[PDB]
Structure formats: C-alpha cells, structure tokens
C-alpha cells in the first residue's frame, strides 16, 4: 500500500514519464534546464550582494556617537520645558523620542507634562501643527 522507503512513485509522475516515446527524456531535460537557470540566478545575486557589501565597508563606526548617562530628575527647568514643547512639535505623541531628547526625563514624566501644561503651552495647538505636516 505504501512504496518502499526513499522510492518515489506517484500516479501523476508515472503518467507524465509514460504517454510518449520520449516523455521521460523531455521531463528530465526540462528539469536540467530549470536547474542551470536557477544556478544562473544565484551567481547573479551573489555578485550583486558582493557589490552591496563593498559600499558597507567601514560599517557605521565613524558616524557613531557616545551615549550620555544622567539620572531621571523630576524637576522641570525652564530649559527642559522649552525643549519639550519643541520635541512635541517635531515628534507628536512619540513619548519615547521626546524623553530621549530631553535626556533626564522618563516616559511617564513626559506624559505628565502633557497633562500638567496642556493649557499653558497650548499642547492641543502644538499637536495640531504636527498633524498638519
């Protein structure tokens, strides 16, 4: 009921290899040409990817910066409030980006700023200006 292990025989393939005097050698040349053209496309893309790696030579090492470490202070200086209002204008509600810019404020502290100074920095208006872009 099952053909022996590692032996492949299907109704479809038997009918395909029979039914002509040279259906066998047709089907086996078809797959030889399919194979050579797939190996063509490999050599093609290997040379393309080899050229793309020439352009990545160096990595991004000369274009990297040091990381600045500083403790999440809850005191908003006027400097930091002014940085926030601009970050809101540039980034919208991306609280993570706003936090990274200011440098010493956690993501929740930024979300509090949105609530505490909504009226006084017209944060509604600033977000509408961002949405318009």
């Amino acid at each position: 009921r099952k053909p022996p292990k590692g032996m492949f025989l299907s109704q479809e393939d038997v009918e395909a290899v029979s039914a002509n005097a040279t259906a066998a050698t047709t089907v086996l040349r078809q797959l030889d040409m399919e194979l050579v053209s797939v190996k063509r496309q490999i050599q093609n893309i290997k040379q393309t990817n080899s050229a793309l790696k020439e352009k990545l030579d160096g990595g991004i090492e000369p274009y990297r910066l040091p990381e600045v470490i500083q403790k999440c202070n809850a005191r908003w200086t006027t400097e930091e409030q002014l940085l926030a209002v601009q970050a809101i204008r540039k980034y919208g509600r991306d609280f993570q980006a706003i936090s990274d810019v200011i440098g010493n404020k956690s993501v929740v502290q930024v979300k509090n700023f949105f609530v505490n100074y909504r009226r006084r920095f017209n944060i509604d208006e600033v977000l509408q200006e961002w949405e318009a872009e």
């Binding site: 053909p3 109704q11 029979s18 066998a24 399919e34 490999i42 393309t48 990817n49 910066l65 810019v101």
Partner: protein
C-alpha cells in the same frame, strides 16, 4: 516440519485440509462430517510418511494397513481408496524402487510418449507400473533432453540442468535417495569483479544490491497499487516497469536539487533586500551625522532652538544607528543560513556509471533466473510461482544430472534417433508417424490408444512446424503456445589442469561495461571435484552469442579470468564446450516463462488434453486421445526438472484414470 505433518509438507500438500483433487476422488468425505475428514487426512498423511521414510521399496496396500492403528485401520476400504489415490497420482511409488508385486502378466492399453526427457521418462515408468504398454520416441541419440551432461575423461559438467532448488517439498529429494546423486550444497557468497578486474568494495556492493531489491518492490507497487499493467494497448513488461521506476528516481534527484537551490535564491534575495535597506540607511546616517556636526559647531551659549537642534539630531542619529545594528545582526543570521544550505546539498546523481553497471549485473542475474530478457517478462505475473519455492539450500549434482534420466530409462522401451513428424488422433485411436534422424527416408508408424506429447514449447512454437497435428490443434491450444514465453540461457564449460581460483567460493560475478552486454559471461561457477569453471550467458546476450564461435567465446572467458586472477595464473584450457539451446532443433530454447500478456492460466491450458471429433456423424462424445506433459505444462513448478517430473506423474495418473478406470472414486 516433522511427523505426519512433515510428510504432507514434503509432498506439497496441506496437512489439515483436503485438496481440490482429493475432493473430486472423495466427494462423499469432503461433503460429509468434519470428523471423517480428519480420519481421511491422517490416513493420507501417514501413508505418505511410510513411503517417504523408505522410498527405496514399493509401499503396498497391505503394508500400509499393517502399520495403521485404531481407529484409523477400522475402515479398510477407505484405506484402500486412499492408497490407490496416492499411487495413481504418483505421490507414492514413483521413481526407481524395488517392486514387491512383480509387473502384471498381461498389458492393458497402448501409449506412445513423444520425447524421453524427465517428463516423458517419469510418465512412462508410471504407466508401465500401472500395467500399460509404453513406447517412448526420442529424436536424440540419448535420453534426458534438457538434462544434458558433458563427460570426457574425469571431467563432468552439466550443459543443461545442474541445480536442485532446495529439498524441502521437492520430489527430487525422493529421487536422490533412489539414485546416487552426489548433492553438494552451494554457498551463496558471490564476489563481483568489475570490467577492469578489480573487486567491488564491500560497502558499494551492498548499496547497489539493496537498491536492486528496492527497485523490484517498486515495480510490484506499480503493478498492484497503481495498476500500471497496460500502456498504449500493450502489456507492460518487468523491464519497462524498471525503466519507469529508475526514471522517477532520477526525476526525484533533480526535483530535490531544484527546491534546494530555490531555497538558496529565496535567502539570497532576502539578503539583497536587506543590504539595500542598509546602504540607504548608512547614507542617511552619514548625512544626519554631518548635520549634527554642523549644529554642534554653533558654540554655546545658544538659544533653545539651536540647543534643541543639537539634541534632536543626536536622538534621530542614535535611533537610526539602532536600526542599522538590528539589520546588521539579521545580515549575520542570513549569511550563516547560506553556509548551512551550501554545505548540505542533496544528491548530485541517482546512480553513477560504476553504480549503474553493477546494477546491470543484478539485472543479468535476474535474466539468468528467468532465462529471458527482462523486457519479455510479464510485470504482473513473472514471479507467480514464488509461493511454491522449496525450503533448504540449493545443491549441485556433482556426478552429473544425466544419472537421473539414465536411471529412469532402465526397463523402458525407448526408440532413440526417432524424430516424430506427424501426430494423428481420431475417435478410434492414434497414429504417430516418425523417421530415422540419420536416414530420414526410413519411415515408422506407431499405432496406439493415446499419445503423450512432451515436445518442448520451442518445438511446439516452430513455424514452419517440425511436428504436424492431424487434425490441427484447436486455437485455444495454439494461442497458449503463441503467448507463452520460451527463453534461452547458455553455458561455457572450461576444463583446466589446475585450480587458479578461490576453492572456497562456489560462484563469482563479472560486471560487463555495457547494459547490452550485461548477461555476457556475467557469472562463473566452481562446483565440481575436478578443476572446472562454468560461465553463464544470460539475457539478450544468450541469443547473440550463439552466432559467435567457441574459440572466440573461450577467448573472451580467458580475457575476463586473466583480469581477475592475473595473466600468468590462467592457463589455456584442456577441454571446452559451449551450449547453444536456441539452435538445438529438439529444444529451440531452454525455459518457459510468463511473457507480457500471458499468465499462469496458459500453463493450465498447455496441460489440458485434446479430444477428437466423432468418427461417424451422431456417434457419442469420444474419449480424450492427445495428452501434454513437460516443464511448460505445470503452473506451480514451471521451467524445472522437478516440474517436468511432476507433470509426467500428473499425466500418467490422468491417462490411467481414463484407460484403466478409477475404482477408488466410489
């Protein structure tokens, strides 16, 4: 097995069940209660055992009843019926045995037997044993037919039959006790040596052999499960089926390579798309870095928009440097997956050249086994007789198989050099017309009640005919003769002054360099006391090699042998012989086979006797006159000495039932 159950087995009967033939002779018993059947079966089995324990002497009804206990020796007529059954059909008191009751005073009925091979000889003994007048007509100057033995000096080698194919269930077991056959077992270890002369490595030899067996199972799957038995209104052969199966394995190799290299491109194009992302992101990073640099040139103190510009470009740049680092890790994962894939390819080929040549040896060996090219064998039916194969190892007849027919010939009336030309059969009787093979104008007429034809299938096939039937054989017989296959297989006997080969190895192969020549001198046998090597010519090579001379064939044999054992180790042979069974006009081939578009049923058709028309119109349905035995007439043991023997025993029983009556059937 053993006991009474072993006697059933050794006589090819089921110990616990009544056969179809028994049902015909004992309908009262088999239709009757199950208790009486067990009594019948025991009597039968016990009677067989008594014969088998000592087949050197006749087993009489009296002696049988003597050794039966109660309740089995109760019914004496049942025991007499069973004994007569077994005797009549050659299950007991067959072959060469001392008779306790000397042959009857007056002979009853007259039978002509055409051919003095094992089938003819065995029938002749039985008919004479039953009290009939028997004469055998034989075209050759000897008995045995396709049992032919070469004898010169102390060299002895069989050009025809040479192997007993196991003793378990084999009637030749009984004959080996009756006649001195030096049966020596054949060790099946067979090393192969390629065309160059180098042995095939043990690792490779097993790889190819296993593949051969898997290829065969595969054809069986094709036949039974997929029903691939007709193609273009033509029956499919075993050879065709094997090509189709092989082609599909080559296809699968290519399909696996295809989908493997397709995985490499899919990964390579995933990498291409990633590297383009990285080139463009590196260009943005380069530009954004410059902008941060420029915004930092504006030295402090500075307004808060200028400060924001520095801080926001710093953020934007590290965010893009994160992205590039993630993409750079994914680049490493895809690049290692390409080494994985490129290190582990599937198979390059299904079979190499050396592989395919070794495989062709296994196909040649199968062509030897069926005595015909694989393109001729029925896919469905080529192995129909496998289930009846005997147990035990195969044995060589070391003193020459001719000892058997020569022994069976003793006491029989055999006209040698007598070639039958015509067989006439009518409601009144038969007339066999034959000539002397030497002076063919000298004509003989044999008048008889019945003719038993053991002419080979190759002879029956001859067009134009060697033997004419009057009236002609009916189409149901002639079509069976046409459909049945008659193959070919030849031997080359090489007699030397000394042994230059391994004396502990009975056989060894030679792998030919081409498929066309795969059967040519493909196997050598070392079976005899004297230094004799026997080379086989199987498959398509058999027929072709008959038109090449002995000197050239023997030269090709030595060439091969020099390759395996070294040029100075192989002398010129003292004596050589080459068989040509297809050329032989009293054979015209070697073995029957189930050809494509034939079946086992054609063997039954070959065995069926012919009944002539009535002599005068409106006269009653006459008696059967022309009977058939031989190798080619026995469905379950075709193409063998034991089959021939059994077919002879069968027909003697049928003829005697007909012309002497069967008292035992009441």
């Amino acid at each position: 097995p053993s006991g009474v159950e072993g006697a059933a087995f050794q006589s090819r009967l089921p110990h616990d069940r009544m056969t179809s033939q028994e049902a015909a002779c004992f309908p009262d018993i088999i239709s009757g209660p199950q208790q009486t059947q067990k009594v019948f079966l025991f009597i039968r089995n016990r009677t067989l055992q008594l014969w088998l324990d000592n087949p050197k002497i006749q087993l009489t009804f009296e002696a049988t009843l003597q050794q039966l206990e109660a309740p089995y020796n109760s019914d004496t007529v049942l025991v007499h019926r069973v004994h007569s059954y077994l005797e009549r059909h050659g299950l007991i008191n067959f072959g060469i045995y001392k008779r306790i009751k000397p042959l009857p005073t007056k002979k009853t009925g007259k039978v002509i037997i055409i051919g003095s091979g094992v089938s003819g000889l065995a029938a002749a003994r039985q008919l004479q044993s039953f009290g009939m007048d028997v004469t055998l007509l034989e075209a050759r100057d000897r008995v045995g037919g396709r049992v032919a033995t070469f004898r010169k000096g102390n060299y002895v080698a069989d050009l025809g039959a040479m192997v007993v194919t196991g003793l378990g269930g084999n009637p030749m077991a009984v004959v080996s006790k009756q006649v001195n056959m030096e049966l020596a077992k054949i060790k099946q270890k067979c090393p192969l040596y390629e065309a160059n002369g180098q042995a095939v490595p043990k690792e490779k030899d097993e790889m190819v052999e296993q593949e051969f067996n898997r290829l065969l199972e595969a054809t069986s799957y094709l036949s039974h499960q997929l029903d691939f038995n007709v193609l273009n209104n033509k029956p499919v052969s075993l050879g065709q089926a094997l090509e189709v199966v092989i082609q599909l394995q080559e296809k699968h190799v290519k399909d696996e390579q295809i989908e493997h290299w397709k995985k490499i491109v899919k990964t390579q194009e995933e990498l291409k798309e990633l590297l383009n992302k990285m080139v463009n992101l590196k260009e943005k990073i380069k530009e954004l870095h410059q902008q941060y640099k420029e915004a930092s040139e504006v030295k402090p103190p500075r307004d808060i928009t200028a400060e924001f510009l520095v801080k926001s470009k710093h953020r934007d740049l590290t965010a893009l440097c994160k992205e590039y680092d993630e993409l750079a890790e994914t680049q490493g994962k895809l690049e290692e997956k390409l080494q994985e894939l490129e290190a582990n390819p599937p198979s390059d080929v299904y079979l190499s050249s050396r592989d395919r040549q070794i495989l062709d040896w296994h196909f040649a060996n199968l062509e030897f086994a069926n005595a015909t090219p694989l393109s001729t064998l029925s896919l469905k039916h080529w192995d129909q007789d496998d289930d009846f194969e005997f147990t035990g190892s195969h044995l060589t007849v070391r003193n020459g198989y001719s000892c058997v027919p020569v022994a069976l010939a003793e006491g029989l009336d055999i006209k040698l050099n007598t070639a039958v030309r015509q067989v006439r059969y009518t409601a009144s009787g038969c007339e066999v017309i034959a000539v002397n093979t030497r002076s063919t104008s000298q004509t003989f007429i044999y008048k008889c009640d019945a003719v038993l034809c053991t002419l080979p299938l190759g002879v029956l096939k001859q067009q134009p005919p060697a033997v004419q039937f009057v009236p002609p054989l009916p189409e149901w017989k002639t079509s069976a003769v046409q459909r049945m296959g008659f193959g070919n297989l030849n031997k080359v006997v090489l007699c030397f002054d000394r042994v230059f080969w391994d004396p502990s190895v009975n056989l060894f192969g030679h792998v030919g360099s081409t498929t066309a020549s795969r059967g040519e001198l493909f196997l050598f046998w070392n079976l005899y006391k004297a230094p004799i090597l026997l080379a086989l010519v199987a498959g398509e090579a058999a027929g072709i090699m008959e038109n090449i001379s002995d000197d050239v064939i023997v030269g090709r044999c030595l060439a091969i042998l020099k390759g395996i054992f070294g040029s100075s180790a192989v002398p010129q042979p003292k004596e050589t012989v080459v068989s040509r069974w297809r050329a032989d006009p009293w054979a015209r081939g070697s073995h029957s086979y189930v050809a494509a578009g034939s079946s086992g049923n054609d063997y039954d058709l070959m065995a069926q006797p012919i009944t002539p028309g009535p002599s005068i119109p409106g006269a009653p349905q006459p008696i059967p006159r022309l009977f058939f035995a031989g190798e080619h007439t026995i469905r379950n043991y075709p193409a063998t000495v034991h089959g021939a023997l059994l077919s002879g025993l069968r027909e003697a029983g049928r003829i005697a039932d007909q012309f002497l009556g069967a008292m035992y059937t009441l």
